[PDB]
């Protein structure tokens, strides 16, 4: 569960970056 | 290809005002005087002392060569004579001076002075005399449509002061150089204290740009590469954490 | 000389240009600065282009300097505003869009400010969502 | 002579477009192969679930 949470965090950061793109 | 224009040649430094055409011609003449040779400048819209002062900004010291006698600065106006008298005086001075390089700046001055057929006659006679005597000639011209004077000349250098997004960037083309191989590329001629410096183009998507546009494209590529690497790291970390998740599920 | 176009518009080209060359020569010989206002440009040692252009239904005032023989003149087109206090020149906003130099400059200022506010609000929403998902994970783990 | 769409280009732009097309075909190849391997692993998953 904790690792899935971390991966979701990373995905949200990636989505912010893509929006920047 | 070969190290420059052929000695016996007619060169055309054409441009719009503020493109440094007179500066490039002055560089030609100063090189002639530096090689131990002897050269003429024929200014038809500027004074000799003014020319020395102004080119000392770009770093040439034409005064030394003038004093040495390897430089003769003839300043005459287009309307103070008849074009035929201009031809005669120029030919006579060139004969007594026996130069190697001759600059005519601007040959555009002898336009309204006379009929255009007579203008072509004058220019062709001058070009033929210089070539036949084996003298390198530089002919500055002012202006994009049709001029017709390019065919008589054997080399064409086009100087340009182009407005790009509220900035006047300076560009140089070597449009033609008969009997040689030359770059079909737009170099960027920067005027500076040290001299005139031609910088190479930026090869890639969008062309050469050559200026603040080059800086914009370089910054875009930089930011985009950083973005790509950040995305790569993000995906690697996601993969690693999902792998931890699956390994822990297997252990469970 | 405000303006020299008066001679040109009517006189023979050769005659008027001869008179112009003579005037310039005399002034320079006597060591006198010579301003010539015009509505051909290589006889002058400095050239200032003044422009009142149309931009999105609004006319804007741009001044720039495209010639100066013995000096280094800025290649940028600055925005000149006339006013009672005097004639002022404001520099352009460098970077994206180039210079704009008008009410479109104000518009780009506004757009960039709006986009920065939006970036901040959206990074905040992502932070809040991340904190809430962290709390969800903590709760599930305790369960 | 140029052919098809895209125009004569005639220059570094033509060479750049040909490079783009080569890269695009290579990427098509990679996409197809990766899809096939993904199908194989998805199958492995399903067959193992069936065994369970
Ligand atoms: N130190 C310097 N730095 C930058 N530009 C210079 C410098 N000295 C001269 N110039 C440039 O040289 C130009 C004059 O070139 P010139 O040979 O008169 O061209 P043209 O013959 O077309 O008028 C000016 O526009 C000026 O910007
Ligand atoms: Mg000049």
Author numbering:
A (entry chain B): 516 to 536
B (entry chain H): 258 to 400, 407 to 515
C (entry chain G): 361 to 399, 412 to 515
D (entry chain L): 464 to 515
The publication says:
Here we investigate the primordial circadian clock in Rhodobacter sphaeroides, which contains only KaiBC, to elucidate its inner workings despite missing KaiA. Using a combination of X-ray crystallography and cryogenic electron microscopy, we find a new dodecameric fold for KaiC, in which two hexamers are held together by a coiled-coil bundle of 12 helices. This interaction is formed by the carboxy-terminal extension of KaiC and serves as an ancient regulatory moiety that is later superseded by KaiA. Our kinetic data identify the difference in the ATP-to-ADP ratio between day and night as the environmental cue that drives the clock.
A closer inspection of the CII domains in KaiCRS and KaiCSE/TE (Thermosynechococcus elongatus BP-1 referred to as KaiCTE) showed an obvious difference in A loop orientations: an extended conformation in KaiCRS compared with a buried orientation in KaiCSE/TE. Furthermore, the sequence similarity between KaiCRS and KaiCSE is less than 30% for the A loop and residues considered important for stabilization of this loop in its buried orientation (that is, the 422 loop and residues 438–444). Together, our structural and kinetic data support the idea that an exposed A loop is key for the KaiA-independent enhancement of nucleotide exchange and hence autophosphorylation in KaiCRS and perhaps other KaiBC-based systems. The dodecameric KaiCRS showed constitutive kinase activity owing to its extended C-terminal tail that forms a coiled-coil bundle with the opposing hexamer. This structure elicits a conformation akin to the exposed A loop conformation in KaiACSE, and autophosphorylation occurs within half an hour. Notably, the coiled-coil bundle provides additional hexameric stability. In detail, the KaiCRS dodecamer is stable for extended periods of time in the presence of only ADP, whereas for KaiCSE, oligomers are not observed under these conditions. Furthermore, the C-terminal residues of KaiCRS-S413E/S414E interacted with the CII domain of the opposite hexamer, whereas the lack of electron density for the last 30 residues in the wild-type structure indicates more flexibility in the dephosphorylated state. The wild-type protein dephosphorylated comparatively quickly (observed rate constant = 11.5 ± 0.8 h−1) in the presence of only ADP. Consistent with this accelerated dephosphorylation rate mediated by the coiled-coil domain, our crystallographic data showed a phosphate group on Ser414 for KaiCRS-Δcoil but not for the wild-type protein.
